[PDB]
Amino acid sequence: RQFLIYNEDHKRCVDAVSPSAVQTAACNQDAESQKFRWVSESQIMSVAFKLCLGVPSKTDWVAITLYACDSKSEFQKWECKNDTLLGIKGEDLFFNYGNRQEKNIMLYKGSGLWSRWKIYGTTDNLCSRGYEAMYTLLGNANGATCAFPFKFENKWYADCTSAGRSDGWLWCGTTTDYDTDKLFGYCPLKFEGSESLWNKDPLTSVSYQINSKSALTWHQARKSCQQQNAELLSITEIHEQTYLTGLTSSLTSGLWIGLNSLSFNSGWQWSDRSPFRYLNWLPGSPSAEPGKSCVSLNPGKNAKWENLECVQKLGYICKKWPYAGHCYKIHRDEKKIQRDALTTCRKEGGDLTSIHTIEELDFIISQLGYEPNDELWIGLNDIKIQMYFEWSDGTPVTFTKWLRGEPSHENNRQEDCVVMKGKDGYWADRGCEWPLGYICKMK
């Protein structure tokens, strides 16, 4: 994530000589004085000096030297324009070198070959290696992001470090002055022992990271799992939900899971695109309140799920007619209830239709004769195991497309069968004792 600043024309890299002298030198990957890194969306810091590149004013031909890193300073913000060009944010003044025998980097109005810089060893501009906020693990910062650079025992560190430790674990300070604030966390990076944070289910080889100490938003939490090559927890099996109930049996604070309702066109879904085929809501949830689109697993309430406003700060859990060999047919003439429609499809040699891909769903709606005012049965049901939807034909449930607000599966309404209704062909659950069309499927 650290880079050298290279000027292709000169064949020279930027070199930090002193906090008040930023110049150039023969490129050297091992010369720490030449290494830099993005520490914010707009700040470029020196790795050797832990100081940020800036200017005294946004005026033509001033000296670019190192400054104390300041997230509020308009004079330390850089941005890429017209690809390689590197200029001060908000002005047509650029990172220049070479004019008028000046060995120091200068902010110049020209946009020639001496104002364009690439990441040494690549053909990309500096912005290609942009800053990625790093959410801490464990620690006492409640999941806050690393702050670079930070001061620890009167030394400045530009990256995660194991200083003050013998176990090689990498950590960082979430504030600039760690020695004073004492707020820290471990870095979401690889290091001998990093897997200690993950619980590996011996049944399915799936890994889970339980971050009960952090306090992040739903969207922040998801990025934490993502930056660890993972995603928010998805629960698609009873034995899975139970396992997490065991791991969190001793906790009490709610934990973000991947269950959200953020696609305003569809219903409940998992952030990792897992099929929403298992329900385990808390009494009173999902609530009728419109702002609550994100779901939390509450280990203090039997590990059941509740939906809350996505900005609430909580802990989180990471996780790490023929078509395609079948023949489909719609029945609208004589309408039947679910169990009767099921018998008919089985007498006709098949079963109630199962849907496993968007391609299969797109086929049913566009070809089989579907009309946007339809409401037809499908094989998705939870008659056998309440709250566990399976396909009537016994095939795996790998796909779900719920209508906005579905599956409601309200407490005492026995909504155990699923129908395909609406203009978009999405699904919904309802009582099984109602006459409706149905869709059969066979080989």
Contact by Cβ (8 Å): 441, 391: no
Residue 176 or 408 with smaller CB distance to Ca ion? 408
Helical H runs in 140-290? Answer: 178-181, 218-226, 238-247
Stretch that binds Ca ion, among 195-203, 272-280, 416-424, 427-435 (CB under 5 A): 427-435
As measured in angstroms, the least distance from the Cβ of 368 to Ca ion is 23
Size of the site for Ca ion (CB under 5 A): 2
Residue nearest to Ca ion (CB): 408
As measured in angstroms, the least distance from the Cβ of 238 to Ca ion is 22
Binding-residue pattern over the window 296 to 325 for Ca ion, x denoting contact by CB under 5 A: ------------------------------
User: Is residue 338 classed as helix, strand or coil in its secondary structure?
Assistant: helix
As measured in angstroms, the least distance from the Cβ of 429 to Ca ion is 5
Counting DSSP H helices and E strands in the chain, the numbers are: 5, 33
Q: What is the CA radius of gyration of the chain?
A: 29
Q: Looking at beta carbons, which pairs linking 30-34 to residues 24 or more positions away fall under 8 Å?
A: 34/4, 34/5
Contact by Cβ (8 Å): 97, 86: no
Restricting to residues 106-135, name those near Ca ion by CB under 5 A.
Answer: none
Question: Locate tokens 């200083």: which residue?
Answer: 163
Residue 182 or 423 with smaller CB distance to Ca ion? 423
Stretch that binds Ca ion, among 29-37, 73-81, 94-102, 424-432 (CB under 5 A): 424-432
Binding-residue pattern over the window 365 to 404 for Ca ion, x denoting contact by CB under 5 A: ----------------------------------------
Residue 223 or 404 with smaller CB distance to Ca ion? 404
Which element (helix H / strand E) includes 279?
none
Residue 199 or 408 with smaller CB distance to Ca ion? 408
CB burial class (10 A; 0-12, 13-18, 19+) of residue 434?
middle
Residue 104 or 408 with smaller CB distance to Ca ion? 408
Take residue 138 and report the two structure tokens written for it. Answer: 């464990």
Stretch that binds Ca ion, among 187-195, 202-210, 259-267, 423-431 (CB under 5 A): 423-431
Take residue 81 and report the two structure tokens written for it. Answer: 């324009």
Residue 188 or 407 with smaller CB distance to Ca ion? 407
As measured in angstroms, the least distance from the Cβ of 85 to Ca ion is 56
As measured in angstroms, the least distance from the Cβ of 409 to Ca ion is 7
Which residues are CB-contacts of 80 (< 8 A; sequence separation ≥ 6)? Answer: 86, 125, 126, 127
Contact by Cβ (8 Å): 391, 370: no
For strands 417-421 and 390-391, give the pairing. Answer: unpaired
Stretch that binds Ca ion, among 65-73, 177-185, 356-364, 425-433 (CB under 5 A): 425-433
Give the Cα separation of 191 and 184 in Å (integer): 17
Give the Cα separation of 265 and 373 in Å (integer): 17
Residue 182 or 413 with smaller CB distance to Ca ion? 413
Residue 142 or 408 with smaller CB distance to Ca ion? 408
As measured in angstroms, the least distance from the Cβ of 383 to Ca ion is 16
408 binds Ca ion (CB under 5 A): yes
**Residues found near Ca ion in the complex (CB under 5 A):** 408, 429
